[PDB]
Design a protein around this ligand. Structure first.
Ligand code: CL
Lengths: 241, 235, 244, 240, 250, 195, 111, 243, 231
């Protein structure tokens, strides 16, 4: 039974190492959510600092890949940082070679191809991570593209990742069934973040303080992460209506 | 399976220990060092009477002042001999002198552990390297596939080694003549050999300061065999 | 490390057989039968396509018979993809020889070269062997018409008539029975098709389940012509010989 | 590159891959070598399981390495081609640099050295081939006959056989070959070689190949009829 | 580090089977149904856009891909394997042909190059076979219209019409009854939509079906005018609306 | 070296090559054979830079002898000449090219025809009835243009060759110490020991 | 263009007696018409009762002496502290010098 | 089963058992700690005196990287040295190209990526060390801890080795009782105490205390070993607290 | 058990068995002792013979004029490591005109041994080394283990029955450290130390091997009748 140790086919036509990499994805027990506004793309993720000895400012699963592209990761931090460093390198190389900023979907495809290689080549293991790339693309507008250990990737209207992804996914599905549009019809990103947090609260059934969340926002020509105080202001607005 | 360079729980390299078993299956080779010279003798052990025994080359010249006998997988020895000859000649080229027997032996033993996953396995042959130099005089070394070499006053390797070594233990003394050593190698070879010893299934050689390394003629060895038979019948 | 997962494709069994070669030969024994018959005035190549479909585009299809140069052709039995790797190499070797000596490559030299490549995969590299057996039909001005076969071991032999693939035991007996030395191409064509018709696992032998070729000096004066038969031409020769 | 150690020692001090290569030789068709007073004869078995063969073009069992040396073998046919090619290249290389053709001993030592190298190199298996190398040294009238085997050991033989049922034909040669008086003529040497194969072969038809090598690059292969005459004469003397 | 897997991971078993190729074909069997039909004046390739989530934008995932202006491809099996094969197929069409001869390769030769890449993954060191079967439809001047299937082994066969994946056995039987050598392109598209409906469970419309054709030259899709010999790509992907129009006449 | 001539007659090819070897100011040898037998019915003469000439000839010789043993067959003169040309054409774009010009005289046993090929160090091959390398042709081609008839006997070829060598001995400044003449025909290669 | 060689002047002298040997050399070091040093040792004790001097281009001279001294050290390591005889040292130095045959040590060596 | 026999293999859980076995080697090692103070960091380690024959103050465990970073580790000591050698190469090449000394977060990722790389292949073994490291850069003080998996975070206090639970509890008290912060000289005293308290898990053999520190005010932002009077002052403070 | 097939595999308790098996090879090796004062450092080694006809395997190797070691375990591995030290000592001299520090020599050996414990294909070194030297900070003694662990000590012993000599040195610590400017007394203490590890056999003239390095004493090895003085 060495067909379960390396990335070769089992008699059923399955790759067990790929399937077990998907299971490593939920090892952190963190849920992430991404939604699109009119002018922006918002990504939120649970932040859990279980140890009091930790510096909470360094605990993060959201990464600034390029000026325009942001990436949240679902999975262990070593593999997360591996993927982050590579995506940064690839984005920088792309700009140098082709003279324009790497689009979110193209970077996603590139990272997906790299992941595909690990599923075909035996000496390389898959990374136990799901990578959610976000930006406001200059051609396609607000963009969410997600990559997994199988080498699969696709664009999203909105998406969720983690142990309780299904609860969040259905909650988001039901909202878009009502509105009948592919995005959050809202002008300011502040209100799109408020929507994202509100619907995560509703789906998970848990309240959040400023230190329980982590927020990333993509606008035209920049991606940035919110501080604890920026999130607090967001939580206050939610509570006041 | 398992690594080629793997240690056993006792702290020994599996492959080195297994190559030593192959050497135990080899034909007997005996070396005796004296102050008049070093004698090297081997059991030829032809597998059939149609095999021309003089083509069996288990005693070999490395240089004029260094000879070598082998026991085990004798095909493995050819590259060791080639290296030894090259090392001996190369040193003469670099230093305008003969190379020390120990230094030659050390150069051969450096090849031994160059195996892994370099060659794929250790050598399956042990060597008796006998020679003379101005510094340490007449010397006899036992080069193993472990990379270890011991100097010996007398040594036997191959299938009849422990029986021959016990015999060499009693017989060797620091005042042996060359003639006495020759007969002693013949005596012990005859003891441990399956077939009856004669000039065709056994070979003698010696290294002296004057004449250098010489493989003995079958006519010369035949006389020493006849001389041996008479002196054993003498008491 | 990686050793754990190594099948060791290039080792002897205790009996002194090459596992992977023996298993590759087992693979080839399920492939469609290919037959070669050498005559005094030419060579015949006949081969059976494996359980085809009505929707297969036959006239543009090629799985059995391949052209190496204008003088030499091969019949394939085994993995088609493996065969095409070797065929392209053989085509290049023939062109290398032609460029070097300004003469068409002798059949045996080409056969030896391909057979040496196959051999290499059984002795070194740790890769699986090519699951292919060839029948080489060719002509040169030294030995004239020649038939050879090579198999995954890299061993090759010359033949008057030979089969590879499925039911070779039955096929070889039938060829050995009706073959004669003074035989001609038209007679050899009939023998090849009759042998396939008896050894086939199919219910009946039809034009859409066959590939056919001839190497003839039936080319205008001292020269050789290769003829890869078209579907309609295979249908006609089946009627002529009285099989359909 | 593929570096896997395939030829390795076992607890009892055996290299099984080298020993299993000998089993491939045991399976191969019988080959025999007999040297007379002024000639060497190489006899080879052809298994008659393969008829409808084209004997003009089928690879012959005895191969010329140079104009004065020949090589026959028992074991894997594909493996033998690699050794033969290397040997032929080395023969021309020796002529080029030394300005003298190889001695039979030298050529044997080379082929044996190649075989040994494949028993302690990574990623390769040993040759499943034993060879008989025969000929005459340049400007020498003494016959030469050597044997090699997968392990890489080689030696000279007055007469020797290899391959399947070689135990039987070696039995024959050991009682019939006299060293004090070897086959004085070509006839006597060929006769003894055919006799030795007839102990094992089956039918004396196209199953026996004979190649006679004489001094000064005089090498010739006997035809079916010439061999058939030896086969006829042997059995007519036997009916007594 | 270094790739120390220099040995084959696909090997012959005692029965003569190449296990990894068989298992790759099993992965193809689980894959979503795709099909191809050849007409007199064109070829059609089609498949179902099996969306993994309704939040996912299935337009961003292209199962039917342009390889050259006159050649297209569709698959059944593992999507990521298909995606990298399309990348390599597109590149090899340039490096091993267009940069040499100054023109795009004929369908059969591009298929041959793709097949070669798939064969090498079946024999080379430290890799598994590709877990896809391709259907490659295309046109070239001297061979006309053609349709090829390419399997994990690297074997390829030309088809008049065929299907691969989930419901291929049923779909091929359906095609055998309907196909003839006098079909026009529109008739083939009609048959393609009929055949594909049988294997689809849920929604059956332009947004859940991906369909492309190899047909007439499209000078409107060329992007430039001024060269008479350049007349535009024969490959064309049908729009969601164009599919729905033909579903009313179904 | 200096002068190498070739002439193809009815049933044979005749090669004439100078015997002198001069380095600088001294003639070191006057009996040098500037030729190698490539196969029983193929002979190659050569001239060019010192060392390279013999090194190249013996390299070609070895390759053809290797081919002969492998196939138990003699290559045609045309095939040998094409092999030689390719080696020189490969050589001219090397780090250090072979500076060697050759004539290949062979008798094709299949076609029963003599064949003469002239190849220079660039890999420029031409089949000719008569040929030369270096300054030899400047004197000898006018005589050969006049006297050569293609139906000539071997003896007539030798007489015409004597007239060429006499002209060279008269008008060339260098003393090339006569020539070694060799004939290539159906029976093989032989040397004319009196010339 | 960069010239990797230079001339540091100086002069050395070796004389072999019946049971002794002397190796002398001036202590001046120069470039062109300038004095670099009035006392720069040029003759060196290399061990094993061997003295050496590599006169000419001082950088190559110092490099050679340094490498020979090194050779003496390794000769002891490799051959059981055997004394390097003057004839063996001489042959060893030939190989050191010829090793750079196509980019020579620009020195006149005497031991 | 068999998933734990090879590195870089995911078990059905999604775990890399070989990395988890490397952690066991870390847990077997001596105690080492790190304390982040007001303007710098303090490192301390337990050195078990196996025998009287050990020369005091000679077998130094804490290692400097560049001139501003200190590294200490628990587990297989050679593995830690290998990691520091790499860290020194990484720091050198950073300074070579960018001129400025490597920032601590930047340095942390260099080690992190390298250690993580040794969980990607079966041809290498994971690191048998958890490394506590840090120092002062342009943005101030930073303390990190790096595990065999390649996982690392920033810390207020850090501890690893056999007495990590004891140490962690002590570090947590300091964080609670000093929200405004701890001074560099205080941190050295506290570091000594914590190692002495954590020595109860290794109480069989006696030990030697080793402390180092980087501080903007006390050491000019350079890594230095605590020696002589300041070390003895910390030992006395530590000995007073256990009694 | 299942985790001792190669050096690249931790056991479930975090152990490296191949390294531990390499450590076992040292325990089988013949005893050797190391000890130092403030002025001198001494190595004492019990050499082992194959039989009565054989020579006694050399145990001590010189690395530089101021440094050297004694070995216990696989002798060829000691040759490799001692050769490496010779080169590193030599690089330090040629490039920096600087004698290599004994502590830095230990660090280099540690790092070389470590690479063999973390990589696939290779194997750990099967030998233990005791390095003595005199540098700019006085006399030094190191103990090298092929796990990579190097330790600076006043005195120690490795090999079979080395625990007896190690206990003796642990008692004598305060005495032998003070033996300054007296080489013969420091060797005596070392010869008396190695005697605590002997059983059945005693120290003969071709059995004993001693080495010393100090303030004005180059690393020199004493064998044969040169050690009869100390028997
Ligand atoms: Cl890519």
């Amino acid at each position: 039974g060495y067909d379960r140790h390396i990335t070769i086919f089992s008699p059923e036509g399955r790759l067990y190492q790929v399937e077990y990499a998907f299971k490593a994805t939920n090892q952190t027990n963190i849920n992430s959510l991404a939604v699109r506004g009119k002018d922006c793309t918002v990504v939120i993720s649970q932040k859990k600092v279980p140890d009091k000895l930790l510096d909470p400012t360094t605990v993060s699963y959201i990464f600034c890949i390029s000026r325009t592209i942001g990436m949240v990761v679902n999975g262990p931090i070593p593999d997360a940082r591996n993927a982050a460093l590579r995506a940064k390198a690839e984005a920088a190389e792309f700009r140098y070679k082709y003279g324009y900023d790497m689009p979110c979907d193209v970077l996603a495809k590139r990272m997906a191809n790299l992941s595909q290689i690990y599923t075909q080549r035996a000496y390389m293991r898959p990374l136990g991570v799901i990578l959610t790339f976000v930006s406001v693309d200059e051609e396609l507008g607000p963009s969410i593209y997600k990559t997994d250990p199988a080498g699969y990737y696709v664009g999203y209207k909105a998406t969720a990742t983690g142990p309780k992804q299904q609860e969040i996914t259905t909650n988001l599905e039901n909202h878009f069934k009502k509105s009948k549009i592919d995005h959050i019809n809202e002008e300011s990103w502040e209100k799109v973040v408020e929507f994202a947090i509100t619907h995560m609260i509703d789906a998970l059934g848990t309240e959040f303080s400023k230190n329980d969340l982590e927020v990333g926002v993509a606008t035209k020509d920049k991606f940035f992460t919110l501080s604890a105080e920026n999130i607090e202001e967001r939580l206050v607005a939610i509570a006041e209506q | 399976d398992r690594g080629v360079s793997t240690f056993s729980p006792e702290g020994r390299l599996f492959q080195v220990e297994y190559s030593l078993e192959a050497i135990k299956l080899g034909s007997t080779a005996i070396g005796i060092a004296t102050k008049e010279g070093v004698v090297l003798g081997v059991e030829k052990r032809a597998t059939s009477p149609l095999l021309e025994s003089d083509s069996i080359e288990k005693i070999v010249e490395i240089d004029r002042h260094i000879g070598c006998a082998m026991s085990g997988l004798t095909a493995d020895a050819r590259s060791m001999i080639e290296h030894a000859r090259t090392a001996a000649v190369t040193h003469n080229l670099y230093y305008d002198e003969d190379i020390n027997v120990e230094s030659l032996t050390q150069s051969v033993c450096d090849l031994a552990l160059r195996f892994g996953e370099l060659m794929s396995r250790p050598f399956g042959v042990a060597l008796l390297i006998a020679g003379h130099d101005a510094d340490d005089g007449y010397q006899l070394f036992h080069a193993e596939p472990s990379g270890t070499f011991y100097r010996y006053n007398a040594k036997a390797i191959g299938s009849g080694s422990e029986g021959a070594q016990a015999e060499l233990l009693n017989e060797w003394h620091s005042s042996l003549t060359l003639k006495e050593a020759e007969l002693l190698v013949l005596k012990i070879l005859k003891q441990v050999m399956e077939e009856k010893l004669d000039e065709n299934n056994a070979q003698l050689s010696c290294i002296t300061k004057q004449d250098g390394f010489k493989i003995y003629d079958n006519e010369k060895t035949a006389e020493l065999i006849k001389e041996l038979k008479e002196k054993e019948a003498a008491e | 490390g990686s050793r754990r997962y190594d099948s060791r494709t290039t080792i002897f069994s205790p009996e002194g057989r090459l596992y992977q070669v023996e298993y590759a030969l087992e693979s080839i024994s399920h492939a469609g039968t290919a037959i070669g018959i050498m005559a005094s005035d030419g060579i015949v190549l006949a081969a059976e396509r494996k359980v085809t479909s009505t929707l297969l585009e036959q006239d543009t299809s090629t799985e059995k018979l391949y052209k190496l140069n204008d003088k030499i052709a091969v019949a394939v039995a085994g993995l088609t993809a493996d065969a095409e790797i070797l065929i392209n190499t053989a085509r290049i070797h023939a062109q290398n020889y032609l460029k070097t000596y300004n003469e068409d490559i002798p059949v045996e030299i080409l056969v030896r070269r391909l057979s040496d490549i196959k051999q290499g995969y059984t002795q070194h590299g740790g890769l699986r062997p090519f699951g292919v057996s060839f029948i080489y039909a060719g002509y040169d001005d030294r030995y004239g018409y020649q038939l050879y076969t090579s198999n995954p071991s890299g061993n090759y032999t010359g033949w008057k008539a030979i089969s590879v693939g499925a039911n070779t035991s039955a096929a070889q007996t039938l060829l050995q029975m009706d073959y004669k030395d003074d035989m001609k191409v038209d007679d050899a064509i009939e023998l090849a098709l009759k042998t396939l018709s008896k050894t086939t696992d199919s219910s009946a032998l039809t034009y859409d389940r066959l590939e056919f070729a001839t190497i003839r000096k039936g080319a205008n004066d001292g020269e050789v012509y290769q003829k890869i038969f078209k579907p309609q031409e295979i249908k006609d020769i089946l009627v002529k010989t009285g099989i359909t | 590159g593929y570096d896997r150690a395939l030829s390795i020692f076992s607890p009892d001090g055996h290299i099984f891959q080298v020993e299993y290569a000998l089993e491939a030789v045991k399976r191969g068709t019988c080959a025999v070598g007999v040297k007379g007073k002024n000639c060497v004869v190489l006899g080879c078995e052809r298994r008659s399981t393969l008829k409808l063969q084209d004997t003009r073009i089928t690879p012959s069992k005895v191969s010329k390495i140079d104009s004065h040396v020949v090589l026959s073998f028992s074991g894997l046919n594909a493996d033998s081609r690699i050794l033969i090619e290397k040997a032929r290249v080395e023969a021309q290389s020796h002529r080029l640099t030394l300005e003298d053709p190889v001695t039979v001993e030298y050529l044997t030592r080379y082929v044996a050295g190649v075989q040994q190298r494949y028993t302690q190199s990574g990623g390769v298996r040993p040759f499943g081939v034993s060879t008989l190398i025969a000929g005459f040294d340049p400007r020498d009238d003494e016959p030469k006959l050597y044997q090699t085997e997968p392990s890489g050991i080689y030696s000279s033989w007055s007469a020797q056989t290899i391959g399947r049922n070689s135990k039987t034909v070696r039995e024959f040669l050991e009682k019939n070959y006299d060293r004090k008086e070897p086959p004085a003529t070509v006839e006597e040497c060929v006769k003894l070689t055919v006799r030795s194969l007839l102990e094992v072969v089956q039918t004396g038809a196209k199953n026996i190949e004979i190649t006679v090598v004489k001094p000064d690059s005089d090498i010739v292969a006997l035809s079916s009829e010439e061999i058939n005459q030896y086969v006829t004469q042997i059995e007519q003397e036997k009916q007594e | 580090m270094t790739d120390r897997y220099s040995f084959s991971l696909t090997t012959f078993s005692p029965s003569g089977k190449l296990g990894q190729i068989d298992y790759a074909l099993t992965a193809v069997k689980q894959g979503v149904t795709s099909l191809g039909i050849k007409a007199t004046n064109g070829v059609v390739i089609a498949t179902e856009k099996k969306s993994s989530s309704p939040l996912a934008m299935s337009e961003t995932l292209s199962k039917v891909s342009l390889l050259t202006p006159d050649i297209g491809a569709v698959y059944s099996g593992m999507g990521p394997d298909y995606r990298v094969l399309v990348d390599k197929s597109r590149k090899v069409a340039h490096t091993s042909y267009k940069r040499i001869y100054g023109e795009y390769p004929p369908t059969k030769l591009l298929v041959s190059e793709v097949a070669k890449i798939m064969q090498e993954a079946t024999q080379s060191g430290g890799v598994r076979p590709f877990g896809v079967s391709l259907l490659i439809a295309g046109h070239d001047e001297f061979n006309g219209f053609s349709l090829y299937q390419v399997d994990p082994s690297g074997s390829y066969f030309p088809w008049k019409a065929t299907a691969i994946g989930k419901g291929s056995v049923a779909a091929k039987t359906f095609l055998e009854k309907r196909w003839n050598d006098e079909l026009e392109l529109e008739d083939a598209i009609h048959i393609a939509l009929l055949t594909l409906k049988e294997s689809v469970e849920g929604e059956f419309n332009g947004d859940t079906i991906e369909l492309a054709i190899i047909g007439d030259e499209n000078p409107d899709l060329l992007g430039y005018t001024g060269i008479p010999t350049d007349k535009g790509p024969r490959f064309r992907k049908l729009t969601s609306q164009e599919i729905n129009d033909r579903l009313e006449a179904l | 070296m200096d002068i190498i001539l070739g002439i193809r007659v009815q049933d044979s090819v005749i090669l004439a090559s100078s015997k002198a070897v001069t380095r600088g100011i001294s003639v070191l040898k006057d009996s040098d054979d500037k030729t190698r037998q490539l196969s029983p019915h193929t002979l190659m003469s050569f001239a060019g830079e010192a060392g390279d000439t013999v090194q190249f000839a013996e390299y070609i010789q070895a390759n053809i002898q290797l081919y002969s043993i492998r196939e138990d067959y003699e290559l045609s003169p045309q095939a040998v000449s094409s092999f030689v040309r390719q080696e020189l054409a490969k050589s001219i774009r090397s780090r250090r090219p072979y500076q060697v010009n050759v004539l290949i005289g062979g008798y094709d046993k299949k076609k029963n025809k003599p064949e003469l090929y002239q190849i220079d160090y660039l890999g420029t091959k031409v089949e000719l009835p008569y040929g030369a390398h270096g300054y030899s042709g400047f004197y000898t081609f006018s005589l050969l243009d006049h006297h050569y008839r293609p139906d000539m006997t071997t003896e007539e070829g030798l007489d015409l060759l004597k007239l060429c060598v006499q002209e060279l001995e008269k008008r060339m400044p260098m003393d090339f110490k006569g020539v070694i003449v060799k004939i290539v025909d159906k029976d093989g290669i032989r040397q004319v020991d009196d010339f | 263009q960069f010239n990797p060689y230079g001339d540091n002047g100086g002069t050395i002298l070796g004389i072999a007696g019946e049971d002794f040997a002397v190796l002398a050399g001036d202590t001046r070091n120069i470039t062109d018409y300038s004095i670099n040093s009035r006392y720069e040792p040029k003759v060196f004790d290399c061990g094993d009762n061997i003295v050496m001097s590599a006169n000419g281009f001082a950088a190559d001279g110092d490099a050679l002496v340094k490498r020979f001294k090194n050779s003496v050290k390794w000769y002891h390591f490799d051959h059981n502290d055997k004394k390097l005889s003057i004839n063996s040292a001489a042959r060893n130095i030939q190989h050191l010098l010829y090793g750079k045959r196509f980019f020579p040590y620009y020195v006149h060596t005497i031991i | 089963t068999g998933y734990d026999l090879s590195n870089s293999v995911f078990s059905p859980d999604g775990r890399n058992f070989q990395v988890e076995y490397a952690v066991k080697a870390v847990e077997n090692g001596t105690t080492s700690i790190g304390i982040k103070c007001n303007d710098g960091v303090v490192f301390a380690v337990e050195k078990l005196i196996t025998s009287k024959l050990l020369v005091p103050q000679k077998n130094v465990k804490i290692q400097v990287v560049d001139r501003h970073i200190g590294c200490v580790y628990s587990g297989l000591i050679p593995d830690g040295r290998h990691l520091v050698n790499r860290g020194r190469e990484e720091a050198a090449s950073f300074k070579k190209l960018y001129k400025t000394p490597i920032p601590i977060p930047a340095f942390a990722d260099r080690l992190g990526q390298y250690v993580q790389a040794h969980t990607l292949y079966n041809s290498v073994r994971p690191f048998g060390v958890s490394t506590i490291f840090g120092g002062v850069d342009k943005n101030g003080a930073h303390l990190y801890m790096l595990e065999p998996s390649g996982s690392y975070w920033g810390y207020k206090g850090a501890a690893t080795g056999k007495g990590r639970q004891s140490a962690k509890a002590e570090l947590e008290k300091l964080v609670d009782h000093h929200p405004e912060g701890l001074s560099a000289r205080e941190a050295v005293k506290q570091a000594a105490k914590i190692i002495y308290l954590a020595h109860e898990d290794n109480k069989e053999k006696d030990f030697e205390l080793e402390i180092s520190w980087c501080s903007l005010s006390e050491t000019n932002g350079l890594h230095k070993f605590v020696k002589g009077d300041l070390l003895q002052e910390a030992i006395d403070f530590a000995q007073k607290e256990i009694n | 058990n299942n985790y001792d097939g190669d050096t690249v595999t931790f056991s479930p308790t975090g152990r490296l068995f191949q390294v531990e098996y390499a450590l076992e090879a040292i325990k089988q090796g013949s005893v050797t002792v190391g000890l130092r004062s403030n002025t001198h450092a001494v190595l004492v080694a019990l050499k082992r013979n194959a039989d009565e006809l054989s020579s006694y395997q050399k145990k001590i190797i010189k690395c530089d004029e101021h440094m050297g070691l004694s070995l216990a375990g696989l002798a060829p591995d000691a040759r490799v490591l001692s050769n490496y030290l010779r080169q590193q000592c030599n690089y330090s001299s040629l490039v920096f005109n600087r004698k290599l520090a004994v502590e830095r020599a230990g660090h280099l050996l540690c790092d070389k041994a470590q690479k063999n414990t973390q990589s696939y294909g290779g194997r750990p070194y099967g030998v233990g080394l005791l390095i003595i030297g005199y540098d700019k900070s006085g006399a030094h003694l190191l103990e090298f283990q092929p796990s990579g662990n190097v330790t600076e000590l006043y005195g120690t012993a490795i090999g079979a029955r080395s625990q007896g000599a190690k206990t003796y040195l642990e008692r004598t610590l305060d005495t032998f450290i003070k033996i300054d400017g007296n080489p013969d007394e420091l060797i005596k203490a070392g010869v008396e130390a190695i005697s605590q590890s002997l059983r059945d056999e005693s120290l003969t003239v071709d059995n004993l091997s001693i080495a010393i390095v100090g303030k004005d004493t180059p690393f020199t090895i004493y064998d044969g009748e040169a050690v009869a003085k100390y028997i």
